[PDB]
Amino acid sequence: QVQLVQSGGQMKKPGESMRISCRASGYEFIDCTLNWIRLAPGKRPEWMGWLKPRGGAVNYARPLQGRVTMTRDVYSDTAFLELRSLTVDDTAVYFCTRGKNCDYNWDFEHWGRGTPVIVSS
Amino acid sequence: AENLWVTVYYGVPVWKEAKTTLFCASDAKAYKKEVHNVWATHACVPTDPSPQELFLKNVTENFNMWKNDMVDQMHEDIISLWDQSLKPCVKLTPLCVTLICSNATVKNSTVEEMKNCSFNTTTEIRDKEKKEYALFYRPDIVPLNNETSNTSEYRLINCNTSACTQACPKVTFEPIPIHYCAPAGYAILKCNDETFNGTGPCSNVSTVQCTHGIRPVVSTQLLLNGSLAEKGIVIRSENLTNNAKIIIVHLHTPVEIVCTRPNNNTRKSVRIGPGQTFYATGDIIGDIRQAHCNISESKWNETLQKVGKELQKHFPNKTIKYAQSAGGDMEITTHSFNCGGEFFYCNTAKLFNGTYNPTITLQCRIKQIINMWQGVGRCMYAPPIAGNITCKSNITGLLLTRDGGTNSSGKEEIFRPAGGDMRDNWRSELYKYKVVKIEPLGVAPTRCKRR
Amino acid sequence: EIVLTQSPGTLSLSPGETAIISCRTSQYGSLAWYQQRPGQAPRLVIYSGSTRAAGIPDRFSGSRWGPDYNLTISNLESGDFGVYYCQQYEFFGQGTKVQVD
Amino acid sequence: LGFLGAAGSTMGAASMTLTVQARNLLSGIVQQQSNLLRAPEAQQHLLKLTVWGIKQLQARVLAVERYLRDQQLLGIWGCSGKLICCTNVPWNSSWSNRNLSEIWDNMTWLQWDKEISNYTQIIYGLLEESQNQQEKNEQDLLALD
Amino acid sequence: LGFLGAAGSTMGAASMTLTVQARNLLSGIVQQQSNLLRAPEAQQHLLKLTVWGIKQLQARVLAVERYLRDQQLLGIWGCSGKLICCTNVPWNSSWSNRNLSEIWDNMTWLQWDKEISNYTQIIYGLLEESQNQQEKNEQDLLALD
Amino acid sequence: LGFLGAAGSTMGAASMTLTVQARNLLSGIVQQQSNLLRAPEAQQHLLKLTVWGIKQLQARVLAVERYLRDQQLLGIWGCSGKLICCTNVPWNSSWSNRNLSEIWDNMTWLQWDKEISNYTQIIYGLLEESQNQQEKNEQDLLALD
Numbered sequence A: 001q002v003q004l005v006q007s008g009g010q011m012k013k014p015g016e017s018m019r020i021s022c023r024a025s026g027y028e029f030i031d032c033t034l035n036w037i038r039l040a041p042g043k044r045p046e047w048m049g050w051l052k053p054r055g056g057a058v059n060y061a062r063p064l065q066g067r068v069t070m071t072r073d074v075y076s077d078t079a080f081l082e083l084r085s086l087t088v089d090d091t092a093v094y095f096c097t098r099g100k101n102c103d104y105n106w107d108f109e110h111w112g113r114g115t116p117v118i119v120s121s
Numbered sequence B: 001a002e003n004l005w006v007t008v009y010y011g012v013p014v015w016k017e018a019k020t021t022l023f024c025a026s027d028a029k030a031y032k033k034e035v036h037n038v039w040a041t042h043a044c045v046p047t048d049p050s051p052q053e054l055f056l057k058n059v060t061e062n063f064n065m066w067k068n069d070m071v072d073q074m075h076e077d078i079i080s081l082w083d084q085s086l087k088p089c090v091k092l093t094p095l096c097v098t099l100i101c102s103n104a105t106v107k108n109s110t111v112e113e114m115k116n117c118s119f120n121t122t123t124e125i126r127d128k129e130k131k132e133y134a135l136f137y138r139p140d141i142v143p144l145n146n147e148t149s150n151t152s153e154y155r156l157i158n159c160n161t162s163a164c165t166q167a168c169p170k171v172t173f174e175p176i177p178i179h180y181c182a183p184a185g186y187a188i189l190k191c192n193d194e195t196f197n198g199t200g201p202c203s204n205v206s207t208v209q210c211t212h213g214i215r216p217v218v219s220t221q222l223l224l225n226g227s228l229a230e231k232g233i234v235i236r237s238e239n240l241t242n243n244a245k246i247i248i249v250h251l252h253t254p255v256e257i258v259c260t261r262p263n264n265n266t267r268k269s270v271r272i273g274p275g276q277t278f279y280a281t282g283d284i285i286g287d288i289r290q291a292h293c294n295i296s297e298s299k300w301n302e303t304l305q306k307v308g309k310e311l312q313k314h315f316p317n318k319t320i321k322y323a324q325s326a327g328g329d330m331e332i333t334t335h336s337f338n339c340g341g342e343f344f345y346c347n348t349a350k351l352f353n354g355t356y357n358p359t360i361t362l363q364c365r366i367k368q369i370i371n372m373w374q375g376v377g378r379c380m381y382a383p384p385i386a387g388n389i390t391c392k393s394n395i396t397g398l399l400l401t402r403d404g405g406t407n408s409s410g411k412e413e414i415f416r417p418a419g420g421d422m423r424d425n426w427r428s429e430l431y432k433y434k435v436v437k438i439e440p441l442g443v444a445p446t447r448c449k450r451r
Numbered sequence C: 001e002i003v004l005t006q007s008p009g010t011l012s013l014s015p016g017e018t019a020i021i022s023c024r025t026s027q028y029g030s031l032a033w034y035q036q037r038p039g040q041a042p043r044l045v046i047y048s049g050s051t052r053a054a055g056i057p058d059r060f061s062g063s064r065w066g067p068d069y070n071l072t073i074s075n076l077e078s079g080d081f082g083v084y085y086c087q088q089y090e091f092f093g094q095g096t097k098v099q100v101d
Numbered sequence D, E, F: 001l002g003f004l005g006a007a008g009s010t011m012g013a014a015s016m017t018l019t020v021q022a023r024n025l026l027s028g029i030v031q032q033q034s035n036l037l038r039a040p041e042a043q044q045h046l047l048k049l050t051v052w053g054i055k056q057l058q059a060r061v062l063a064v065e066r067y068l069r070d071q072q073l074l075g076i077w078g079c080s081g082k083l084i085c086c087t088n089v090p091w092n093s094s095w096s097n098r099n100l101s102e103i104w105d106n107m108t109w110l111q112w113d114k115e116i117s118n119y120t121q122i123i124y125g126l127l128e129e130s131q132n133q134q135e136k137n138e139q140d141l142l143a144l145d
Ligand SMILES: *[C@@H]1O[C@H](CO)[C@@H](O[C@@H]2O[C@H](CO)[C@@H](O[C@@H]3O[C@H](CO[C@H]4O[C@H](CO[C@H]5O[C@H](CO)[C@@H](O)[C@H](O)[C@@H]5O)[C@@H](O)[C@H](O[C@H]5O[C@H](CO)[C@@H](O)[C@H](O)[C@@H]5O)[C@@H]4O)[C@@H](O)[C@H](O[C@H]4O[C@H](CO)[C@@H](O)[C@H](O)[C@@H]4O)[C@@H]3O)[C@H](O)[C@H]2NC(C)=O)[C@H](O)[C@H]1NC(C)=O
Pocket: B030, B031, B033, B034, B172, B173, B174, B175, B217, B225, B338, B339, B340, B386, B390, B391, B392, B393, B394
């Protein structure tokens, strides 16, 4: 058994930066991978990224290159997502996820509560 | 049918795999004076003075590099030996008090990174204190633009994680090689054949009693001092479509790389207790220059085009494009690199600006409060070394990642350099040498009669 | 910029009946499905194309024959109809949905 | 080197070199007084507590456990020492009924005992009852009158 | 289970089940590779120094000593392997003189082995004399001419 | 005491007292359950980590290694148990040619095998091929028809 905590959804305007956090408890953070996902209804879900906390590694998605950043903090045991210059296209919900085991990173067993983000004007 | 064919034979050439321990072996000549612990310790055993091998006729076996346990075995063992090296001879540090610095002004000019800094340590008498020039080097100070650092005063970076341990001045650090060999009842098998994709049957197979020596030098995203490949270039990777796993690349031909810590330096002792001795940079002499490295651009471009003409083979009509570092902490992005006790951090942007289808120079920064391995505890503190120091190596491989996102036919494909997982510095050499156990009590129906 | 897809795009079945779904066409990789949206984050249904996932009802089982890859969706309910997805590594499907009644 | 130089040869050739494994089954190149290595020089730090000391003792005792267990399983059937043995028991009905020619002509043992593994306990039971019959017959012969 | 399945049975019945002790006096269920268990999962923490580590190694080597000592004491009399042996020596005058009837008809070894303990050394000495006579006679038989 | 009671005596005298070594080569007075000593009183501190615990484990396992290795070298030649043995190959041309008289009349083993030490591997190989001939002939006898 394991669970993931989130700070909820936050709403904002077009064209600025913002942040969102997630954390994990049990099945220690330092060994196994994390994966962000975006859900826009009426649009295809997009693999946002994956961060290996063991060494600060990251491989962002090419369509979002540059204006999205990730960071870790081992002692606090958290996961920060940062993005810049949001548009209405990014109207979606966000999640933080985990895999079954520490060798595969696609068939996601444990998901967060979900956090909507809407911008209209 | 006479006695319906029952008997038993001894010896019985059969074997099966088994997760089990491995063993030490090193050339035990020079290290008899390093009484304190070090990798190829005076303990263990002298290496066999006569290695043996034999080629086995018609043997068919499926080597599989990513599944084998022994890499994890050594990944635990080296860390444990590291701890047992920095468990004794170590002076727990009551550092992190109020300190104040300013621009060094060694010459009339301001130095690049050092800052002449005061420090009120404890005197030998527990009652009183005294001031001396002490440790500064920039990344290990929590800063502020005011007349002091942090918020006021300042503190060393380590004192909200764990107590950093002093490194033993007497203990050397070099990548002295180590062999491995198995106890009785176990043996090691070797795949001599080339063009091996890390899996599937290997035909040209030879049995070696004890593995060849490796140099377990720790580093990231630039495999160095590793044995060159058999021929041409080879990719050894656990799948490619699964972009999560890391992709290795290994070269037959070497490339010279050299780095220099040009400044002369001298360490000055500072006393911090009854018999506990601190060390740090005392003074600097001569021409001031940043640490850097030199590389021949022509050969680097040749090798990048070589790699390019390899991995194009794994795609029908796609095109490649290198790129600079992914991001995040300095540990993974820059080129981690170890040299005689001093440590180097080198920005690798200039080495990956190329594209597919005379003397490049690298900017680098020394670093003196290391938090490598797990990054969780056991931070160590090396002492600076007297005078200048230079060192060279043969680049052997690179650690790449494939990124992801949406793709279409005719689009470009992007690769980036990464690392971090120290295990992928170890799977480079030890893809050979499966571990195997012999079971000598098989049977077969055969006619016989005792009496 | 899409390679993955799945059929049929939309279905109209009552509660309690069975449906046949399939992902296409030929791109290699481990297949997967993610359950219909209940309102919160969805859960898994299947591993490796044909392995049932832990803590899931027994109503649902996949099948794979090379490019051919089908999933039978049996005994649907109003508490389980919704938008469900097909996935290989990075891409996802067109986002099918089965509507109850 | 033993079968590390002769594993894949013919069955007849395999039986001709079953001996040298005795050195290769107990000695070990590095753990102890091998055929190439004697005790190390810096043994003062070997005897003092060290990780590789525990490794040494673990390896030695595991090898001893292995050899003693196999040699005991071989000895109880009256086959001690004899590299080729023989038993007074037939083979069961199943699994049997394979032609003998290929097994001796060109077969290699790596693929042989794969299917015999699950039935291997049965051969131990059959040899056990063979030894029981043999020892009671020995007792009866011992009973002269 | 060794004698633990048939310890208290009749005198003759004990001989019929002496064999399964070979497994029951070397392997052990839990110390190492056994008839029920294999190597442990978290062996990285077992190989690293631990309170129970020395216990495991002590148990293994103690079992090895136990088996080897008595196996040698049996071997030196030329009785190796033979679960029932025989020697060319008579029995001494004192202790002696007890009838064979009850000893095999209903008696069990539990009530028999106590009183022979203090005299047990004497049997070793007499068996040693037997082996000395046998080896000198073997040497003389070798002397054909 | 083994040879320690009769080491330097005559050649023939040594063969007559080879037997008491079996106790002497495995037991040890002090390591374990000896002919004079049992487990120690304050064993709670022997089991807990101590320098002399590592000493006792090292010594006991080294003795086991020694005995098993030499027995195995003796066992492979079919000479197990037999204190006097015999091999199926005559002696090589070089080294040879020394008279038998002095050796058994007055020599003692201390001065004998020093010259034979460098050639001992040759005798091992000769006994090995002797065993190979013996086992193939055993197979031929096994081939009744
Ligand atoms: C990849 O592979 C390559 C190829 O193999 C390999 O290349 C070598 O890399 C090393 C650096 O890692 C090169 O540099 C060497 O550095 C030596 C400097 O260290 C000296 O000081 C150490 C500590 O003692 C100091 O402090 C005490 C107390 O303050 C003081 O008393 C001393 O005087 C001294 O100042 C000391 O540990 C060290 O080594 C000694 O001990 C080891 C272990 O016992 C022993 O093996 C050594 O022989 C030596 O006795 C050394 O004393 C440098 O000295 C050394 O040799 C130069 O100087 C000596 C003396 O002046 C000359 O005799 C010699 O000819 C050299 O000029 C050496 O230069 C080294 O040069 C590379 N190899 C080559 C061929 O160039 C890489 O390391 C590998 N790894 C990587 C990451 O690249």
